[PDB]
Amino acid sequence: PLESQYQVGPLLGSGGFGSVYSGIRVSDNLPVAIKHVEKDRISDWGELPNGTRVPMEVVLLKKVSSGFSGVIRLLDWFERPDSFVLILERPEPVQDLFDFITERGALQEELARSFFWQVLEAVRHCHNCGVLHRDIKDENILIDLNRGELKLIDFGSGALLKDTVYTDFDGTRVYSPPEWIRYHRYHGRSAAVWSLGILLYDMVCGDIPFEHDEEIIRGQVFFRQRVSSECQHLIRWCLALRPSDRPTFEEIQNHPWMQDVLLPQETAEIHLH
Ligand SMILES: Nc1nnc(-c2ccc3[nH]cc(-c4cccc(NC5CCCC5)n4)c3c2)s1
């Protein structure tokens, strides 16, 4: 069913998420990505409406699939004896945000604003559909270079959204909030907002602000590049030590630094083409 329906191209990469290949759907030459995960390497399992036992990423990707382009679309999936295989959308040309920032260094604020705004819209969409990503970072964001549209990827560390405390975490440590480091406890929205402050810092400074646990706990933000006061303030707000002092998604998008955002296509014409 899958071996014949998709033509397998080169390996795009591999890691904690499994192995992802470039590929093409034979019926219409639609570009795709083919993601393989071994059953033994999945800790977090979930359950579909009908009760089949699948990797959580499949539950979460199904809950967020719709016309909205901010989250990578799950096109199909398959069970094999020892693995799951996910077929996912692939923009062409595409570049992940980690490589994009590596190549350019610190991004101009106008570009960081457009990118960050699109990440916010996408995270809001996930939260509305009951999904917490738990691994928001540059490596998990793709840029559709022609259209200037960002997409969230890798829901393999995700969870169903809930209002009670989380005591498990399997995302990236340096994007994880101080309450996780000190107490192994966090709540969904406020932890997500912390990762977003790390992401925004990363965009405007060209690197993440904290390496060591002690720096995270201390939460002192030092700017290594010229960054406007408004952007610094928003960043420091997202990285408040107390979870309850962090802004809501709404407060982030109504922040003065976030006004007059470019459209995705305007963003591509000025900054990407
Ligand atoms: N960890 C990951 N989980 N899903 C991934 C994913 C999903 C759908 C995708 N469509 C296109 C890509 C893609 C395109 C170009 C580079 C790229 N790099 C990823 C970085 C880890 C390996 C793949 N991914 C893609 C990646 S990467």
CA distance 122 to 128: 10
User: Is the Cα torsion angle 194, 199, 203, 207 positive or negative in sign?
Assistant: positive
Residue 12 annotated as binding?
yes
**DSSP letters of 178-244?**
HHHHHHS-B-HHHHHHHHHHHHHHHHHHSS-S--SHHHHHH-----SS---HHHHHHHHHHT-SSGG
Regarding whether 97 and 84 lie in a shared domain, the answer is no
Among 77, 92, 107, the domain-final residue is: 92
How many domains is the chain built from? 2
Regarding whether 111 and 36 lie in a shared domain, the answer is no
Give which of 95, 107, 94 is closest to 207, Cα–Cα: 107
Q: What is the resolution of this structure in A?
A: 2.3
Residue 143 near residue 272 (C-beta atoms within 8 A): yes
**Backbone dihedral region of 226: left (phi > 0), alpha (psi from -120 to 50 degrees) or beta?**
beta
Regarding whether 64 and 42 lie in a shared domain, the answer is yes
Give which of 74, 38, 71, 43 is closest to 59, Cα–Cα: 74
Regarding whether 97 and 85 lie in a shared domain, the answer is no
Burial degree of 112 (CB within 10 A; 0-12, 13-18, 19+): buried
Edge-first strand order for the sheet with 149-152 is: 94-96, 141-144, 149-152
Residue 18 annotated as binding?
yes
Kindly give the distance from the C-alpha atom of residue 194 to the centroid of ligand 1, in angstroms, as a whole number: 24
Pocket perturbation via mutation, ligand 1, pick of 42, 97, 142, 152 by most ligand atoms within 8 A of CB = 142
Give which of 196, 157, 158, 195 is closest to 177, Cα–Cα: 195
Give which of 161, 158, 182 is closest to 172, Cα–Cα: 158
Residue 267 near residue 148 (C-beta atoms within 8 A): yes
Residue of the nearest CA to atom 24 in ligand 1?
A: 12
Regarding whether 209 and 116 lie in a shared domain, the answer is yes
Known catalytic membership, residue 99: no
- Any bridge partners for residue 7, and if so which? 24
Residue 261 near residue 114 (C-beta atoms within 8 A): yes
Token couple for 51: 């009760």
Residue 14 annotated as binding?
yes
Kindly give the distance from the C-alpha atom of residue 71 to the centroid of ligand 1, in angstroms, as a whole number: 12
Among 58, 92, 126, the domain-final residue is: 92
Choosing from 135, 138, 144, 202, the catalytic residue is 135
**Backbone dihedral region of 167: left (phi > 0), alpha (psi from -120 to 50 degrees) or beta?**
alpha
Beta-sheet strands, E only, within the chain: 6-15, 18-25, 30-38, 45-47, 53-55, 74-79, 83-89, 94-96, 131-132, 141-144, 149-152, 159-160
Residue 111 belongs to domain with CATH number: 1.10.510.10
Regarding whether 114 and 232 lie in a shared domain, the answer is yes
Kindly give the distance from the C-alpha atom of residue 127 to the centroid of ligand 1, in angstroms, as a whole number: 22
User: Is the Cα torsion angle 104, 178, 159, 250 positive or negative in sign?
Assistant: negative
Domain range for 34: 1-92
Regarding whether 101 and 88 lie in a shared domain, the answer is no
Give which of 268, 136, 126 is closest to 201, Cα–Cα: 136
Among 48, 66, 92, the domain-final residue is: 92
Regarding whether 255 and 184 lie in a shared domain, the answer is yes
Regarding whether 47 and 120 lie in a shared domain, the answer is no
Query: Which technique was the structure solved with, according to the deposited record?
Result: X-ray
Residue 97 near residue 143 (C-beta atoms within 8 A): yes
Distances in whole angstroms, Cα of residue 170 to Cα of each of 16, 157, 166, 215, 258? 10, 6, 11, 20, 30
CA distance 16 to 36: 11
Regarding whether 232 and 97 lie in a shared domain, the answer is yes
Residue 13 near residue 33 (C-beta atoms within 8 A): no
CA distance 130 to 136: 16
Strands 30-38 and 45-47: unpaired
